Amino acid sequence: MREIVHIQAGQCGNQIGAKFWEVISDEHGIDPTGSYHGDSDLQLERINVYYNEATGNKYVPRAILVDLEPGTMDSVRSGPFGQIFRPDNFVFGQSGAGNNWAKGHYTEGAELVDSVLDVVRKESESCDCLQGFQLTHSLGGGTGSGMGTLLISKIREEYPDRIMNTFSVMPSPKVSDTVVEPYNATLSVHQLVENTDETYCIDNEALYDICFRTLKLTTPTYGDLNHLVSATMSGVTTCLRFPGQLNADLRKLAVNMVPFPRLHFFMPGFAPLTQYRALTVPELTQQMFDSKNMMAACDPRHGRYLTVAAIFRGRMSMKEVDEQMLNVQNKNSSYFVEWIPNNVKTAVCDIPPRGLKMSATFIGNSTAIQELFKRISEQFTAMFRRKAFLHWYTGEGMDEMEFTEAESNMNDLVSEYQQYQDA
Amino acid sequence: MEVIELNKCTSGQSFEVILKPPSDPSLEEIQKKLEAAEERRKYQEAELLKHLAE
Amino acid sequence: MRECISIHVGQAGVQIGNACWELYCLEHGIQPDGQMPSDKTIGGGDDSFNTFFSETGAGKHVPRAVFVDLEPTVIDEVRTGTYRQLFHPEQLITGKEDAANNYARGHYTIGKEIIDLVLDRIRKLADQCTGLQGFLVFHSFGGGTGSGFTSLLMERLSVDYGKKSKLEFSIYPAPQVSAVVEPYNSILTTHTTLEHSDCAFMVDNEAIYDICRRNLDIERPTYTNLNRLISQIVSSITASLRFDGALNVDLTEFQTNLVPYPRIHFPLATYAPVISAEKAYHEQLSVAEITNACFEPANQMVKCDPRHGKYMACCLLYRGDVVPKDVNAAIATIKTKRSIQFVDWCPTGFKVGINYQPPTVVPGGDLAKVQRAVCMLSNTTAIAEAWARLDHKFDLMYAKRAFVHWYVGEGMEEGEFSEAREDMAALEKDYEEVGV
Amino acid sequence: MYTFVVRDENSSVYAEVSRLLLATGQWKRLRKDNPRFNLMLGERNRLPFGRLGHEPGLVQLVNYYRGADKLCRKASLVKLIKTSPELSESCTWFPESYVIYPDEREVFLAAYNRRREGGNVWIAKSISSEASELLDFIVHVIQKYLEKPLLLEPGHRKFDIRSWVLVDHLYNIYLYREGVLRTSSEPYNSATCHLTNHYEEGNEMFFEEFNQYLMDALNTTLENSILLQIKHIIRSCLMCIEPAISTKHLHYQSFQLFGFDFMVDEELKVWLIEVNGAPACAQKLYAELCQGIVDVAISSVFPLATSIFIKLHH
Ligand SMILES: Nc1nc2c(ncn2[C@@H]2O[C@H](COP(=O)(O)OP(=O)(O)OP(=O)(O)O)[C@@H](O)[C@H]2O)c(=O)[nH]1
Ligand SMILES: Nc1ncnc2c1ncn2[C@@H]1O[C@H](COP(=O)(O)OP(=O)(O)CP(=O)(O)O)[C@@H](O)[C@H]1O
Ligand SMILES: Nc1nc2c(ncn2[C@@H]2O[C@H](COP(=O)(O)OP(=O)(O)O)[C@@H](O)[C@H]2O)c(=O)[nH]1
Ligand SMILES: Nc1nc(NC2CC2)cc(-c2cccc(Cl)c2Cl)n1
Ligand SMILES: [Ca+2]
Ligand SMILES: [Ca+2]
Ligand SMILES: [Ca+2]
Ligand SMILES: [Mg+2]
Ligand SMILES: [Mg+2]
Ligand SMILES: [Mg+2]
Candidates C409, C407, C429, C431; CA nearest to C418 is C407
Whether residues C137 and C169 share a domain: the answer is yes
In this complex, which of D34, D36, D57 lies closest to A322 when CB atoms are compared? D57
Of the candidates C84, C161, C93, the one whose C-alpha atom is nearest the C-alpha of residue C127 is: C161
DSSP A175: B
Nearest to C170 by CA among C195, C131, C143: C143
- How far is it, in rounded angstroms, from Cα D163 to Cα A240? 64
- DSSP per-residue string spanning A318-379: HHHHHHHHHHHHHTSGGGB-TTSTT-EEEEEESSPPTT-S-EEEEEEEEGGGHHHHHHHHHH
- Ligand 1: residue whose CA is nearest its atom 29: C178
Assign residue C305 the CATH number of its domain. 3.30.1330.20
Strands A198-203 and A163-170: parallel
Number of the ligand 4 atom closest to the C-alpha atom of A236: 9
Chain A residue with minimal CA distance to B49?
A: A157
CA distance C70 to C93: 8
Does the CB of A157 have a partner CB in chain B at under 8 Å?
yes
DSSP-assigned letters across all residues of C106-129:
IIIITHHHHHHHHHHHHHHHHTT-
Residue D260: strand pairing partners:
D163, D275
Query: C238 and C285: one domain?
Result: no
To test the contact with chain C by mutation, choose from D242, D251, D253 the residue with the greatest count of C C-beta atoms within 10 A, namely D251
Q: CA-to-CA distance for A199 and A264, rounded, in angstroms?
A: 6
Question: Any idea what the CATH number is for the domain that residue C411 is in?
Answer: 1.10.287.600
Give SS3 for A273. coil
CB A411 within 8 A of CB A117: no
Chain C, 1 to 20: residues with Cβ < 8 Å from chain A are: 11
CATH code of the domain in which C6 resides: 3.40.50.1440
- Do C360 and C397 share a structural domain? no
Domains and CATH numbers, chain D: 2-62 (3.40.50.11480), 68-73+150-312 (3.30.470.20)
Longest dimension (CA), chain C: 63
Contact A59, A36 (CB under 8 A): yes
- Which residues on neighbouring strands pair with residue B18, listed in sequence order? B2, C349
Q: H helices then E strands: how many in chain A?
A: 16, 12
| DSSP helix/strand/coil, B19 | strand
CATH class of A260-368: alpha beta
Answer yes or no: do C263 and C277 share one domain: no
C408 and C376, same domain (yes or no) = no
Report the distance separating Cα D66 and Cα D58, nearest Å.
20
Closest C-alpha to A147, from A369, A396, A346, A384: A396
CB-count exposure of residue C130 (10 Å: 0-12, 13-18, 19+): exposed
Residue A188 in marked binding region: no
Rounded distance between C-alpha atoms, residue C205 and residue C173, angstroms: 6
Cβ(A81) – ligand 4 distance below 6 Å: no
* Window 265-324 of A, Cβ < 8 Å to D: 322-323
Residues C111 and C202 reside in one and the same domain: yes
Sequence-distant (6+) residues with CB within 8 A of D267 are none
Q: Are residues C14 and C160 in the same domain?
A: yes
Q: What is the dihedral of CA A65, A71, A76, A78, to 10 degrees?
A: 140
For residue C11, which of C177, C220, C246, C201 has the smallest C-alpha distance? Answer: C177
**Could you identify the atom of ligand 3 that is nearest to the CA of residue A204?**
1
Q: State which residue of chain B sits closest to A158, comparing Cα positions.
A: B49
Q: What is the DSSP string of C166-205?
A: EEEEEEE--GGG----HHHHHHHHHHHHGGG-SEEEEEEH
Alpha-carbon torsion, ordered D204, D207, D213, D218, to 10 deg: 120
Domain check: are C345 and C251 in the same one?
A: no
Phi, psi (deg, nearest 5) at residue C354: -120, 130
C222 and C76 part of one domain: yes
Is D36 an 8 Å CB contact of chain A?
Answer: yes
Cα separation, C52 vs C63, in Å, equals 6
One-letter amino acid of D274 = E
What is the full DSSP assignment across chain D? Answer: -EEEEE--TT-HHHHHHHHHHHTTTSEEEE-TT-S--SEEE--SSS--GGGSS-STT---EESS-TTTHHHHSHHHHHHHHHH-TTTTT--SSS--EEEE----TTHHHHHHHHHHH----EEEE--BSSHHHHHHH--EEEEE--SSB-EETTTTEE--EEEEEEE-TT--EEEES--EEE---S-------S------GGGEEEHHHHHHHHHHHTS--HIIIIIHHHHHHHHHHHHHHHHHH--TTSSSEE-EEEEEEEEEBTTS-EEEEEEESS----GGGHHHHHHHIIIIIITTTS-----SEEE---
- Mutate which of A169, A209, A225, A230 for ligand 3? The one with the most ligand atoms within 8 Å of its CB, which is A169
Among A9, A118, A12, A108, CA closest to A65: A9
What is A369-423's CATH topology? Helix Hairpins (1.10.287)
Measured CA distances, A292 to A214, A222, A345, D23 (Å): 8, 19, 21, 31
Q: List residues bridging with C168 in a β-sheet.
A: C137, C200
Distance CA A35, CA A95 (A): 36
Asked which of C382, C401, C427 is the last residue of a domain, the reply is C382
Domain ranges of chain A: 1-259, 260-368, 369-423
Active site residue C253: yes
CA distance, residue C296 to nearest chain D CA (Å)? 7
Let me know whether C216 and C326 are in one domain: no
Whole-angstrom distance, CA of residue A228 vs CA of residue A169: 12
Q: Check: CB of residue A374 under 8 Å from CB of residue A297.
A: no
Residues C263 and C279 in one domain: no
C68 with C198, same domain: the answer is yes
Please, do chains D and B touch (3+ CB pairs < 8 Å)? Answer: no
d(CA C232, CA A337): 39
Tell me the C-alpha distance between D282 and D284, whole Å.
5
Which residues of C lie inside 8 Å of B (Cβ-Cβ)? 104, 108-109, 111-112, 152, 155-156, 158-159, 162, 195-196, 243-247, 324, 327-328, 331-332, 335, 342, 344-357, 409-413
Chain-centre distance for alpha carbon D114:
32
Domain that holds residue C66: 1-267
User: Considering its fold, how many domains does chain C have in total?
Assistant: 3
Side chain identity, residue D211 = N
> Cβ separation of D66 and C305 shorter than 8 Å?
yes
Q: Is the peptide bond before C175 cis (omega within 30 degrees of 0)?
A: no
Q: CA-CA distance, D254 to D39, in Å (whole number)? A: 10
Architecture of domain A1-259: 3-Layer(aba) Sandwich (3.40)
C302 closest CA partner among C237, C386, C185? C386
Angle between helices A10-27 and A222-236 in degrees, nearest 10: 50
Method: X-ray
Q: Determine contact, residues B15/B3, Cβ cutoff 8 Å.
A: yes
The residue annotated as part of the active site, out of C55, C253, C385, C410, is C253
